[PDB]
Amino acid sequence: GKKGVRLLVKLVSTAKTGFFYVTEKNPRNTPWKLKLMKFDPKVNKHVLFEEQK
Amino acid sequence: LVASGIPSPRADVALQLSTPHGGHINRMINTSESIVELDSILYRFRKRLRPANIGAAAMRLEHLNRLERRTPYALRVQRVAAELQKYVATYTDRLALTQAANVLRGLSAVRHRLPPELVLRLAAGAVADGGAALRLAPDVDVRDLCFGLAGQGFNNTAFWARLCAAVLPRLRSFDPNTLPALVTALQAAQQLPAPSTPQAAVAAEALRLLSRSETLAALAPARLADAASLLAGLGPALGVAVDARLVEAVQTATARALPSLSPNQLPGLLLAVAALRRAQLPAALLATALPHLSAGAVTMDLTAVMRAARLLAPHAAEPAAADTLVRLARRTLLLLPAPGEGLVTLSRVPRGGQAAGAVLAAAAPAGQLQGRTAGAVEGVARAFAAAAPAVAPQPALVGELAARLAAAGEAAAARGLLDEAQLASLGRSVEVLAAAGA
Amino acid sequence: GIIWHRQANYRHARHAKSASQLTRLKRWKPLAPAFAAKLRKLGFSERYWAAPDPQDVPGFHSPRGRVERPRRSAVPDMDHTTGEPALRQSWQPPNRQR
Amino acid sequence: XXXXXXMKLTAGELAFPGMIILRQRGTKFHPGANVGIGRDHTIFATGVGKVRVDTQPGPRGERRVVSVEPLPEALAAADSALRLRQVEAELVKRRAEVKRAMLQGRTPLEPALYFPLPRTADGQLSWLERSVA
Amino acid sequence: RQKAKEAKRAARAKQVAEAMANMPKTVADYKASRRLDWSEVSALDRXXXXXXXXXXXXXXXXXX
RNA sequence: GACACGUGGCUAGGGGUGAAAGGCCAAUCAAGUUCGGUAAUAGCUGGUUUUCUGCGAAAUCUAUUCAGGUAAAGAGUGUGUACUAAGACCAU
RNA sequence: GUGCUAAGAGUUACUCUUAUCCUCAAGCUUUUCUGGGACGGAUGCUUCCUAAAUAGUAACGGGAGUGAUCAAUGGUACUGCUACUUAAAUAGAAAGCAGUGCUUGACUGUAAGAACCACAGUUCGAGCAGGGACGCAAGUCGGCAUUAAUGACCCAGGGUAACAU
Ligand SMILES: [Mg+2]
Ligand SMILES: [Mg+2]
Ligand SMILES: [Mg+2]
Ligand SMILES: [Mg+2]
Ligand SMILES: [Mg+2]
């Protein structure tokens, strides 16, 4: 809702080729840039994914 | 997945069917895995069938009838055969040698005989030239044509002369396992006389091709059984001789091709090599083929248990031969109806594809009494009267075996399938078994 | 002769759906028999998603166009007076004609 | 809505892999041999066999354990795990052929399009076309 | 035009190969920045997860 | 007399005229009459014309600018296919 | 469109072009359920009673919820203690209460078979391939004990890939 500040945001790969994961995040409770190791099908190896809008 | 109980589309079948290419009806025929499935495909496209589709339908009817273990005289098979016979009569001069060979082999292996003027048209269309049809067609088409025309009657002996004159220069370029079908087709008609001469010449050159080493070790299994039978039946009459090179090659390749024969093919091959050594069963070959004979006796039809019982007739005192023979005794007890089924029930017989006729072979095994098994109960009776001391340890078993042999003989004599000589031999064998049974 | 279509509920909002649900919605399903019967009687015989261009075949090319202009097509059409009688129950008379 | 939640296949009913045996809210019935359990505690069969419902001692009280007992003609045609998988595969293939024979070509089983092969990945069978480098 | 297309394909292949070579250092940097079990918020030390959140948020503000 | 009458004339329809009443404008005027578009439109009402024979429902359910309309499912008929059944009862 | 107005332009008051307040003349809209209509109330989804011991079952019939939260409240492997966990029902020696060590399976491509069901959709799903996580292993992991938090298509926008100009 409008009171709930949690939004959907995008996780862009470090490797290249722009594969991404869209996952939700709380801005207030997480002012990190969200970084997780996820599978990248273009390279078929796990790489890192930082948060960009 | 349409509606949760309807089968989801298969992967390779959807990949094969979704093409820009033509050939949809033949691909639907080739993915039909049972009989009225094929009949519904022939019903859906009955205003759309062409000669290629008729050839594919005949071949698929042949394969699906052999794929189950149900008789070719079933009403479903005969209806599909007559429906294809209508289109064969429509396109009787348009069919090329591929399609004519397809429809002839497919309608002969389901034992549906065409009208003989149609067979005459379909063979004269194969030879209405300077033999040019039989020189542009591959070896499998000639094999299927010969197998189809060995059925449907048609022992014309003038058509066969020009066919054998056309196939004789091309025969050494053939793949070496289509040769036994050619020799069997020549023997199956009234050709190869004195139990004209280009037929005997091409049979002799085919058996000269089959007799050699380095190919006889390269035939497929169950083709070496027919090749060994043809050699043992036609060696001294026309072709190759007694010589131990051939018998050594046959025994060596038989020791390698043992597991790849179905249990209905093993005793034919072993009687073939027994006839080969008389032109016997040598050491350390029976001791490795007999575990296969015991392991194949659980699923083995009654003429095959004849051939195995005749094979194990001249020696019974050996314990491995003895319990193999009591395994065949229990098998013959199983598939022959009681004089008074209970294995499976008749209400649950599959209408499906895989071995549905085998389930119908159990669940009241009466009704499988055709003429082949009608003479074959007499043959099995003789073969078990020959093998006394192997089964005679079991008194009640051989007594019930004699009861079922006598019951089947009386029933099939009532059906008109036996005569007085076979009845007398059956009576002698059943009184020998019943005297041994008490 | 079966009429096939892609499954709906897959264009957007894929974050709120499970992995199995998204895998299930990628598949195609045949139309229901009643709807398929109406389309078959209406005369629907489309063998391709879009018509293949007669150009782009080797040897069959424009005399002066390097290729051609594609013109991406839209799919909205519903009015109770003029377009798509299939998408309206009745016909509405026009608005006074000036 | 309707939310139908009951037991679909009773005890002594022959089951095949994937068939839902019971649908419940919470583990009223607990999974046993040759039986899987879903997210919503749906009990589904992972082997060909007759369903058996037996009661066993439990942590709170009288646990009911739902199981699938394999056929006695299976485990005789079957190291053992590979042999069972081969026997189950043939039974599953036979079931499909019998079902296709009983539904006499009156349902739309396979795509058969006039199009180029339905989109195929290296694995194949994708109803999703994806452009390749 | 195809020469420009192959040049773009080679350039993107080159950058993905270089980043894939650099990539083990990037996961090690991320894993080290999340790891906190050394040099705690103070010399008090006295509870592991409580000390593994305040420093992590302080490092997140430092590494923002 | 802010009168009445007679004879021609002028203002005409989304317009005229009105000491103003939704009044009058050739006996149906909050939009004249006639002709044309026009065989307008009407999920509404009414009606549908010779005979015999066989079979024979439904008024539930879901969706709907939709609940007096429509479409799908259920229940009907003809045709095809196929089981001693994907059927009905009864017993254990 | 119409009347004034604004800003440019022409013959050089008048006329043209463009725009827009306030007037005049029009053209279009202005749902539905309802023991009549109006008024009031409601229109998704989940649970409990009706609902009659498979399932299912109505009424502006009766009582609680919900349009989320959480980078841990996810996954995996463990450590202590024992009457709670929640919207209700079914359940739970952990699916409860406090903790830890690593991690992102809160994946990529699929999936036989079923529940359900007018259709669209909805629900479970063993198994296979890839690359990974935890665990000595056994083996689990395609978000959270489940049932709510899931708005088609069109249109518009973004990343990437192929073809084209
Ligand atoms: Mg008018
Ligand atoms: Mg009624
Ligand atoms: Mg109604
Ligand atoms: Mg919502
Ligand atoms: Mg785009």
Taking alpha carbons only, the member of B166, B172, B231 closest to residue B199 is B166
For residues B210 and B227, the answer to whether their CB atoms sit within 8 Å is: yes
CA distance readout (Å), A28 to A7, A25, B251, B313: 11, 9, 86, 93
Phi, psi of B216 (to 5 degrees): -65, -25
Q: Say yes or no: C47 contacts chain D, CB-CB below 8 A.
A: yes
How far apart, in Å, are the Cα atoms of C77 and each of C86, C87, C89, C92, C97? Answer: 11, 9, 15, 16, 22
The answer to whether D67 touches D32, Cβ cutoff 8 Å, is yes
D112 CB within 8 Å of a chain C CB: yes
Q: How far apart are CA B96 and CA B101, in angstroms?
A: 8
Half-sphere exposure of B98 (CA within 13 A, CB side): 9
Compute the Cα dihedral for A35, A36, A37, A42 and give only its sign.
negative
Q: What is the DSSP letter of B438?
A: -
Query: Strand F: which residues have Cβ below 7 Å from it?
Result: B 36, 39-40, 43, 76, 347; C 32-35, 38, 89-91, 93, 97; D 102-104, 106
Where on the phi/psi map is residue B355: left (φ > 0), alpha (ψ -120 to 50), or beta?
A: left
Q: Round to whole Å and give the CA distance between B150 and B139.
A: 16
Straight-line distance from CA B329 to C1' F67, in Å? 78
Q: How far is the CA of C75 from the centre of ligand 5 (A)?
A: 17
What backbone phi and psi angles, to 5 degrees, belong to A24?
-85, 160
How many angstroms separate the Cα of B133 from the Cα of each of B44, B100, B162, B185?
A: 33, 11, 12, 19
CB B189 within 8 A of CB B154: yes
**Cβ–Cβ gap C28/D112 under 8 Å:** no
Residues D48 and D91: beta-carbon distance below 8 Å: yes
Give the residue numbers in A contacting C (CB under 8 Å), as ranges. Answer: 8, 22-24
What is the 8-class DSSP label of residue C57? B
Sheet holding D14-15, edge to edge: D14-15, D49-56, D63-70, D29-31
Provide the CA B264 to C1' F41 distance, Å, integer.
83
Give the DSSP H/E element, type plus range, for residue B285: none
> How many residues make up chain A in this entry?
53
**Inter-residue contact B130 to B165 (CB < 8 Å):** no
CA distances from B292 to B227, B233, B312 (A): 21, 25, 13
Tell me which chain C residues have a C-beta less than 8 angstroms from the C-beta of B2: 29-30
- Residue position matching structure tokens 């429809």: B103
**Beta carbons within 8 Å of B39's beta carbon, 6+ residues apart:** B76, B79, B80, B83
Q: In this complex, how many residue pairs, one in chain C and one in chain D, have their CB atoms less than 8 Å apart?
A: 20
Integer Cα distance of E8 and B155 in angstroms? 75
Taking the CB of residue C1, how many other CB atoms lie within 10 A of it?
Answer: 8
* Residue B264: count of CB within 10 angstroms of its CB: 17
Cα-to-chain-centroid distance, residue E7:
31
- Neighbouring C-beta atoms of residue B110, cutoff 10 Å: 23
Distance C64 CA to ligand 4 centre (A): 54
C-alpha B93/C-alpha B128 separation (Å) is 11
Token output for E55: 């420093």
Cβ of D75: how many Cβ atoms within 10 Å? 14
- CA pair distance B360, B339, nearest whole angstrom: 19
User: Is C15 within 8 Å of chain A by CB?
Assistant: yes
Does C2 contact chain D (CB < 8 Å)?
yes
Q: What are phi and psi of A13, to 5 degrees?
A: -70, 145
Alpha-carbon separation of residue B419 from B19, B215, B380, B413, B428 (angstroms) = 59, 44, 16, 7, 14
Q: Which of B436, B320, B438 is nearest to B384 (CA)?
A: B436
Backbone angles phi, psi at B184, to 5 degrees: -65, -35
Residue B18 has its nearest CB partner, among D97, D107, D111, at D111
Q: Measured between alpha carbons, how far apart are the two ends of chain C, in Å?
A: 49
The angle, 0 to 180 degrees and rounded to 10, between the axes of the packed helices B286-295 and B319-334 is 20
Contact B372, B301 (CB under 8 A): no
Give the Å distance between the CA of A1 and the centre of ligand 4: 10
One-letter-per-residue 3-state SS of B184-239: HHHHHCCCCCCCCHHHHHHHHHHHHHHHCCCCCCCCCCCCHHHHHHHHHHHHHHHC
Torsion angle defined by CA atoms of residues B161, B166, B168 and B170, in that order, rounded to the nearest 10 degrees: -160
Cα D131 to Cα B227: distance, rounded to the nearest angstrom:
55
Q: Which nucleotides of F are covered by protein (CB under 7 A)?
A: 37, 40-43, 66, 69-73, 81-86
Tell me the pairing of strands A36-40 and A20-25: unpaired
Chain centroid offset of residue B284 CA = 29
Q: Rounded to an integer, what distance in angstroms lies between the CA atom of residue B328 and that of residue B322?
A: 10
How many CB atoms are closer than 10 A to CB B72?
Answer: 16
Distances in whole angstroms, Cα of residue B113 to Cα of each of B82, B126, B360: 10, 19, 25
- Asked if D70 contacts D33 with a C-beta cutoff of 8 angstroms, the reply is no
**CA B219 – CA B241 distance, rounded (Å):** 20
Surface-to-core class of residue A12, CB atoms within 10 Å of its CB (0-12 exposed, 13-18 middle, 19+ buried)? middle
What nucleotide is nearest A1 when CA is compared to C1'?
G67
Q: Helix H segments across chain A?
A: none
Strands, sheet with D20-22, edge to edge from the N-terminal-most edge strand:
D20-22, D43-45, D35-37
PDB resolution in Å: 3.0
C94 Cα–ligand 1 center, Å: 18
Write the burial class of residue B11 (CB in 10 Å: 0-12 exposed, 13-18 middle, 19+ buried): middle
Is strand G in 7 Å reach of the CB of D63? yes
Q: Where are the beta strands (DSSP E) in chain C?
A: 4-6, 28-30
Task: Find all residues with CB under 8 Å of B318, minimum gap 6, and list them.
Answer: none
